[PDB]
Design an enzyme around this catalytic site. Structure first.
Site, PDB file in Angstrom:
ATOM      1  CG  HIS A 248      -5.071   1.002  -4.891  1.00 43.53           C
ATOM      2  ND1 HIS A 248      -6.034   1.748  -4.303  1.00 43.53           N
ATOM      3  CD2 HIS A 248      -4.130   1.904  -5.396  1.00 43.53           C
ATOM      4  CE1 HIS A 248      -5.709   3.052  -4.402  1.00 43.53           C
ATOM      5  NE2 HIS A 248      -4.537   3.144  -5.062  1.00 43.53           N
TER       6      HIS A 248
ATOM      7  CG  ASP B 159      -8.642   0.174  -2.328  1.00 39.14           C
ATOM      8  OD1 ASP B 159      -7.686  -0.652  -2.216  1.00 39.14           O
ATOM      9  OD2 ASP B 159      -8.543   1.246  -2.975  1.00 39.14           O
TER      10      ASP B 159
ATOM     11  N   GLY C   9       1.342   9.694  -5.983  1.00 37.15           N
ATOM     12  CA  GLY C   9       2.012   9.342  -4.731  1.00 37.15           C
ATOM     13  C   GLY C   9       1.216   9.612  -3.463  1.00 37.15           C
TER      14      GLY C   9
ATOM     15  CB  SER D  26      -2.652   6.170  -3.070  1.00 37.78           C
ATOM     16  OG  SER D  26      -2.682   6.503  -4.440  1.00 37.78           O
TER      17      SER D  26
END
Ligand SMILES: [Cl-]
Ligand SMILES: [Cl-]
Ligand SMILES: [Cl-]
Ligand SMILES: [Cl-]
Ligand SMILES: [Cl-]
Ligand SMILES: [K+]
Ligand SMILES: [Zn+2]
Lengths: 193, 17
Positions: A68, A92, A148, A150
């Site tokens: 993502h 993901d 920030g 991730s």
């Protein structure tokens, strides 16, 4: 354009600090060229496109991050853009071969539920594992504190990788839990699929 | 609670206004 390394987090009692490596203009230019000649260090790279920024964590010679954030993008590299080695959309999860200077974590094999989350600000926070891909934040913090982060790592007490941070589970802007991609998904991906 | 995603703006320390 390419994902670009714009800084790094270096891990040490688990501690962390961060260093900037690129500015915004160089980040943009390097994104268009796919060519990054900068020296790489640390376990965790701060990465960015022209539109968004996040973390990538090196486990066993691969730099992993969230789909993502990175989509299908190449990683800017000394010999030009680096094609993703693993691209797992349903999970993901994407990975590139680690830039050579990067320092790899090795997967957790001890099974501890006492975890640490390393954030984009290089703060190390306690998480209790509750299942394959969730842990509660033992000290709840505003979701802004986790913006920030991730793709950053979850670590066990021995400093081995348990997973990579995906999303916050929040009530009213307070993060009470994290959702993460298990290190087992990385090994299933490298098999595999 | 709901899942919140945590991307930030471009760059090492993204500009917020
Ligand atoms: Cl730069
Ligand atoms: Cl060159
Ligand atoms: Cl360069
Ligand atoms: Cl993409
Ligand atoms: Cl371990
Ligand atoms: K900058
Ligand atoms: Zn462990």
């Amino acid at each position: 354009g390419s994902v670009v390394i714009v800084g790094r987090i270096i891990l040490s009692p688990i501690t962390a600090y961060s260093q900037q490596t690129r500015g915004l203009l160089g980040c943009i230019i390097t994104s268009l060229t796919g060519r990054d000649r900068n020296q790489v260090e640390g376990e965790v790279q701060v990465v960015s496109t022209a539109t968004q920024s996040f973390l990538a964590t090196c486990v066993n010679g691969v730099c992993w991050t969230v789909y993502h954030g990175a989509g299908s993008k190449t990683l800017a590299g000394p010999k030009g853009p680096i094609t993703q080695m693993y691209t797992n959309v349903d999970q993901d999860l994407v990975g590139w071969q680690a830039p050579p200077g990067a320092r790899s974590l090795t997967p957790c094999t001890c099974g501890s539920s006492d975890l640490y989350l390393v954030t984009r600000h290089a703060d190390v926070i306690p998480v209790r594992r509750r299942g394959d891909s969730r842990g509660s934040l033992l000290s709840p913090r505003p979701v802004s504190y986790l913006k920030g982060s991730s793709g950053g790592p979850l670590l066990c007490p021995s400093g081995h990788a348990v997973g990579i941070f995906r999303a916050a589970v929040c009530t009213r802007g307070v993060a009470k839990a994290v959702d993460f991609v298990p290190v087992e998904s990385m090994e299933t991906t490298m098999r595999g699929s | 609670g709901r899942l919140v995603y945590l991307l930030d703006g471009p760059g090492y320390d993204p500009i917020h206004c």
